[PDB]
Amino acid sequence: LQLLNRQQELNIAKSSAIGNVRIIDNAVTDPNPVRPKKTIIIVIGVVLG
Amino acid sequence: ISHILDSISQNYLAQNIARQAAQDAKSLEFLNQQLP
């Protein structure tokens, strides 16, 4: 009986998988593109000219 | 803004205690699915 109770504890420990890693935020996309950065490009162009 | 900040605090508080019991909650969930 002692091993059977231990076996069940190992069975429940196997199924209760949630562990060291947890997904807080699933990925989403920022709708504003990060490149090219238009304003800084234009400023650099004017200054270079 | 005060209402919004209260809602943020309440949501975060409620979330935290859920995470404390989350490990037990899933184990209880599995046993309920595992009871013959």
UniProtKB/TrEMBL annotation, chain B:
<comment type="similarity">
    <text>Belongs to the etk/wzc family.</text>
</comment>
<protein>
    <submittedName>
        <fullName>Putative transmembrane protein Wzc</fullName>
    </submittedName>
</protein>
